[PDB]
């Protein structure tokens, strides 16, 4: 049976790399052409690639046994022994990290449920600073299932060691480059997105991350190749592969307007034929529909502006 | 039948998204000691794929909102945020056939929320600020597009007015009862979940919310009728309705073991036949399979 896509507008979709709505749909040839994104990676056959999870609630999150200690001149230190987010054992394997672990860099503020023996809020949510890396002293080994975070504190918070789900509060010094997965060493990765025919560029699904920035109020963009809804859709459907790519149309259902055609390559990324040098944004209220299977060398109609 | 049969996504409950709090599904159970006919407004879908109540498409919308934020310092309270609500994609919120903007919380207590706030303090341009928002169970008026949150502060936080996305950090004094949608007045609602045949009880998909508690206590459970993936599956598929319910089997795929049969009623809730006194939990690693359309009065095998 023929591949089909869910009948859902991009503006109603979930981003696959930060847990927020999709706000933007664009191409930008000035950005890195062949990103090494490890989340939002799915084959059209519905095989999950890299660290891609099924649920949007797993994206840029983790789960762990937390061990806490106080250390003078740092504060409260969390050592997180990672587990998969459903609680099933994390075993180093065919990917960089537990499913959904962040695939970008900077200093991530994370939130976990903490329990204290102290008076007041026995149960509260604590913000920790986690350096994603690569950094000389990051010493993060999510591949090995060990990561570290801290929060400044004058004295021990008297936290109880136990199970945590960590979610992202904000990003400081975001860089779209893979974190320190294995304390400097190589790990198994989803390959760089691509390749592209000449004249083809990555279609980007964009969201904006809660950030800390001392000086600049501009929203911080992060892109993914497909919305999370497309990941779950291919995962469940197990469609048959019949060529190297699907020719898609991006159509407004109400007017019938055909905004552009594009190629969803089997490896789970969308190319448009675009010759401009700067960003071109698209309305987020159309629908992607499958037109047919096409070979790798299929030549798309160029998109205007 | 010339019509395409209903199917369900091949996804284990433990890999699904909760429909009423933005977290994984951790639990699957029945518990006849809980309210049998909840007025949940999120996670409400017709098998025909029509979204009911305030149910959004994306899990990223669940228990979140979007607004134009106006900040002020108020004597007796602290920093106050006046949120003029907008739908979470930026389209205009107009009071209509539902209680609130899509995804707006459908429960009570004091919700700790997080928003991006620009400050006029030098060296502190962008930060995240936490506010407390009283959802209810009792003036918020989300139906009218107006809600307020606050933080105890000695003086103005020097915040710049603008667009926000608010996400839930924690719940204090959680009560699974619909909030004050309209200053005490009625609003349109998804109907109460039910009805149930004699001996039938609601299947619950369970998650646990980040909480503030002075008394320690256990994880804070919140249930939904269907995981978010089932909502988007019916929304996209627009299946034809051929009877009042679908008989499902919950089966372990590796071992083939049938764990139970159940009825998914057209209004988007699942019933099991269970007469025990306490809760009964189920493994979260099975798959729901559609067997057939059955009548309202189909009698399930007990568990």
């Amino acid at each position, epitope marked *: 049976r023929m591949v089909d896509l869910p*009948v*859902i*507008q991009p503006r*109603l979709c979930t981003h696959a790399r930060w847990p927020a709505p999709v706000y933007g749909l664009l191409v930008d040839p000035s950005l890195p052409s062949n990103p090494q994104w490890q989340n939002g990676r799915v084959h059209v056959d519905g095989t999950l690639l890299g660290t891609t999870p099924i649920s949007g609630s797993w994206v840029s999150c983790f789960a762990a046994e937390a061990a806490y200690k106080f250390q003078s001149g740092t504060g409260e230190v969390a050592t997180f022994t990672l587990i998969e987010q459903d609680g099933s054992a994390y075993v180093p394997g065919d990917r960089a990290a537990p499913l959904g672990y962040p695939d970008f860099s900077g200093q991530l503020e994370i939130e976990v449920q903490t329990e204290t023996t102290k008076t007041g809020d026995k149960l509260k949510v604590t913000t920790f600073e986690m350096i994603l890396g690569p950094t000389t002293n990051a010493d993060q080994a999510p591949y090995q299932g060990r990561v570290f975070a801290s929060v400044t504190a004058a004295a021990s918070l008297d936290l109880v060691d136990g199970r945590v789900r960590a979610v992202p509060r904000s990003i400081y010094g975001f860089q779209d480059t893979i974190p320190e997965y294995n304390d400097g060493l190589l790990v198994p990765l989803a390959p760089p997105i691509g390749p592209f025919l000449p004249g083809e560029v990555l279609l980007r699904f964009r969201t904006y991350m809660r950030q800390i920035d001392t000086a600049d109020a501009a929203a911080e963009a992060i892109d993914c190749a497909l919305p999370q809804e497309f990941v779950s859709w291919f995962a469940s459907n197990a469609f048959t592969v019949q060529s190297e790519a699907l020719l898609l149309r991006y159509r407004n*259902t*109400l*007017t*019938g307007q055909l905004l552009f055609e594009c190629k969803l390559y089997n490896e789970g990324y969308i190319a448009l034929s675009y010759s401009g040098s700067g960003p071109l944004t698209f309305p987020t209220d159309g629908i992607f529909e499958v037109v047919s299977w096409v070979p790798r060398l299929y030549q798309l109609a160029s998109v205007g502006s | 039948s010339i019509y395409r049969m209903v199917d369900l996504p091949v996804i284990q409950p433990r890999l699904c998204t909760h429909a009423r709090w933005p977290a994984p599904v951790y639990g699957l159970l029945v518990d006849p000691s809980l309210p049998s006919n909840p007025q949940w407004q999120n996670g409400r879908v*017709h098998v*025909d*794929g*029509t*979204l*009911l109540g305030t149910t*959004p*498409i994306s899990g990223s919308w669940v228990s979140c909102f979007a607004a134009e934020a106006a900040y002020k310092f108020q004597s007796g309270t602290g920093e106050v945020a006046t949120f003029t609500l907008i*739908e979470q994609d930026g*389209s205009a919120y*107009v*009071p*209509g*056939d539902r209680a609130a903007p*899509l995804g707006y919380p459908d429960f009570s207590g004091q919700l700790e929320i997080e928003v991006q706030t620009e400050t006029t303090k030098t060296g502190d341009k962008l930060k995240v600020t936490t506010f407390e928002m009283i959802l209810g169970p009792t003036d918020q008026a989300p139906y009218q597009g107006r809600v307020f949150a606050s933080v105890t502060a000695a003086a103005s936080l020097d915040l710049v007015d603008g667009r926000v996305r608010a996400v839930p950090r924690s719940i204090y004094g959680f009560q699974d009862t619909i909030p004050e949608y309209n200053d005490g007045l*009625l609003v*349109p609602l*998804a*109907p109460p979940i039910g009805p149930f045949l004699p001996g039938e009880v609601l299947l619950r998909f369970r998650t646990y919310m980040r909480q503030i508690d002075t008394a320690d206590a256990a994880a804070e459970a919140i249930d939904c009728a269907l995981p978010q993936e089932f909502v988007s599956w019916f*929304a996209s598929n*627009a299946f*034809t*309705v051929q009877s009042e319910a679908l008989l499902l089997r919950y089966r372990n795929t590796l071992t083939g073991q049938l764990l139970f049969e159940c009825k998914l009623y*057209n*209004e988007g809730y699942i019933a099991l036949s269970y007469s025990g006194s306490g809760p009964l939990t189920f493994p979260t690693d099975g798959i729901f399979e559609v067997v057939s359309w059955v009548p309202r009065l189909y009698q399930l095998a007990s568990v």
Partner: nanobody
Framework: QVQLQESGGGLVEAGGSLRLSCLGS????????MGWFRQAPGKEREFVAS????????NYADSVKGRFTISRDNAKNTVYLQMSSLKPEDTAVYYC??????????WGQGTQVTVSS
């Protein structure tokens, strides 16, 4: 072009009744949940009634409960509003609306209902 066209309004006595219809063209009608809305002169557009794709779970504004019935016939691409026990406060332009997904994003041009007192 996705289009909705209302008919059936007019002038009617208080306590009387009429039935509005709305015809869909250029869409797969059975994929749209439908609603009726109205705008009374000087007032905001308000919700009157909603029904699902398949004609399930009808819901009503409190002011019209028991008196108005929404129904549909997908084989005829048509949604209906039976308006009974009419009151002066029911005087309005009545609009048909379709919801493919999350929003009422297609609208009829509207039909006038005048209840005489």
């Amino acid at each position: 072009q996705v289009q909705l066209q209302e008919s059936g309004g007019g002038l009617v006595e208080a306590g009387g009744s009429l039935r509005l219809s709305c015809l869909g063209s250029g869409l797969t009608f059975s994929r749209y949940a439908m609603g009726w809305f109205r705008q009374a002169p000087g007032k905001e557009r308000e919700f009157v009634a909603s029904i699902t794709r398949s004609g399930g779970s009808p819901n009503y504004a409190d002011s019209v409960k028991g008196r108005f019935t929404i129904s549909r016939d997908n084989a005829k691409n048509t949604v209906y509003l039976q308006m009974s026990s009419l009151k002066p406060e029911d005087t309005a332009v009545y609009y048909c609306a379709g919801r493919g997904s999350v929003y009422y994003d297609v609208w009829g041009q509207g039909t006038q209902v005048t209840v005489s007192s």
